Structure 1
Amino acid sequence: GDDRELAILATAENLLEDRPLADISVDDLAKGAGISRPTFYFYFPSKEAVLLTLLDRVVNQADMALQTLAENPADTDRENMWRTGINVFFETFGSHKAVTRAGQAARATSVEVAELWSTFMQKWIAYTAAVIDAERDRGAAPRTLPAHELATALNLMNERTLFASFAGEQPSVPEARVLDTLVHIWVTSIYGE
């Protein structure tokens, strides 16, 4: 039963690797999931609710991985610690590029997708700023910009640069180089005087 729902989600993710949400119909979803069209509408109100759920699962996966990291300090220098935290996003979203791309194009039209993204971005920026503040309180980072404004720009940078790399946009940082590039900007801007 939760089976049919997972089948629908797995079909949508497979089809989104090939074409946009606009080019996928409810029948394609139903057909791929081994069900009828009215049976589909029982699990989801629309193909957009299917995308909404896929992005929800992707965002919550990253957010949980991040909480795991937070409760379990990695034992390394400062630079590697930022790298590990950014890496959560590089791997989680980079393992679901079709959902990332469609979820981002849907922010322009779907109020729920825009709100879901915006809640989590606020959470990840607040956490980033709490860490920068701890680093300043401990004397490891200088008091330059307002931690929260600095955290806002760096998280926006990552959203745009990661997602450009994953879609292979022109211009974009090659995906093999994007982690190194962002970590350098984060560590210089956070610790640089």
Structure 2
Amino acid sequence: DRELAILATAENLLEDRPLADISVDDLAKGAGISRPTFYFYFPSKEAVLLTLLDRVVNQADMALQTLAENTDRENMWRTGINVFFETFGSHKAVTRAGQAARATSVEVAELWSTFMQKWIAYTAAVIDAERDRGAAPRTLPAHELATALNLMNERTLFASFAGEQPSVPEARVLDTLVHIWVTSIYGE
């Protein structure tokens, strides 16, 4: 509860500054607590980002699970990719911080890797279902095609939300990715 306040403070601060320019004293102060009381909840600011990413990742995973318990094929994929556009799009600071943190934090890398393996495995299953039903041609190995498409979405989403040059404009991202997914899944 003082915990949530640390979390909300970190999320707020990461909007304007990297994690490197946020001190533990910054988190404690925004949360209305002392520095030692902070250390009772988190051993470090990295530990804060980790929890924030865990929440975001689980939120996208739960929304995708919701979707999976149920339009034409283009709209089907668009709704799925939209889960990630919206969830990560709603937590750009955290998303952006956690991506950069993969390169330093072994635990951030593991968290991200676990969830990506999951989303890939789900994409691959649907793609195999589409093949099984005769909707999609048996072209590339489904799991490798799934891997490349999910890596694309990851990089494209995060570049767009960060305003990186180069990037697809946020308002064009969803159409761009959907076109690529549908053509590479259903085409030959």
TM-score range (shorter-chain normalised) is over 0.9
Give, in whole Å, the separation in 2 of the partners of 1:37 and 1:60: 29
**For each residue in 1:124-172, what CA deviation from the matched residue of structure 2 results, as whole angstroms up to 9, or x when unmatched?**
0000000000000000000000000000000000000000000000000
After TM superposition, the score normalised by the length of structure 2 is 0.99
How far 1:79 sits from its partner (Å)? Answer: 0.2
One of 34, 44, 51 as aligned partner of 2:32: 34
**For each residue in 1:76-121, what CA deviation from the matched residue of structure 2 results, as whole angstroms up to 9, or x when unmatched?**
1100000000000000000000001000000000000000000000
Give, in whole Å, the separation in 1 of the partners of 2:37 and 2:163: 37
Q: Which runs of 5+ in 1 are unaligned?
A: none
Give SS of 2:102's match: helix
The percentage of aligned residue pairs carrying the same residue is 100
Once superposed, which parts of structure 1, at least 4 consecutive aligned residues long, lie more than 3 Å away? none
Give, in whole Å, the separation in 1 of the partners of 2:104 and 2:26: 22
How far 1:10 sits from its partner (Å)? Answer: 0.1
CA RMSD of aligned residues (A): 0.4
**Structure 1 segment 174-185 matched on structure 2, within 5 A:** 174-185=169-180
Does 2:155 align with 1:160? yes
How far 1:67 sits from its partner (Å)? Answer: 0.2
How far 1:186 sits from its partner (Å)? Answer: 0.1
Give, in whole Å, the separation in 1 of the partners of 2:3 and 2:74: 41
How far 1:71 sits from its partner (Å)? Answer: 0.7
**For each residue in 1:10-57, what CA deviation from the matched residue of structure 2 results, as whole angstroms up to 9, or x when unmatched?**
000000001000000001000000000000000011000000000000
Give, in whole Å, the separation in 1 of the partners of 2:48 and 2:118: 24
Name the residue aligned to 1:192: 187
Give, in whole Å, the separation in 2 of the partners of 1:121 and 1:18: 27
Give, in whole Å, the separation in 2 of the partners of 1:11 and 1:132: 41
How far 1:5 sits from its partner (Å)? Answer: 0.3
Give, in whole Å, the separation in 2 of the partners of 1:25 and 1:177: 36
Give, in whole Å, the separation in 1 of the partners of 2:16 and 2:164: 17
Give SS of 1:21's match: coil
Give, in whole Å, the separation in 2 of the partners of 1:78 and 1:47: 43
Give SS of 1:65's match: helix
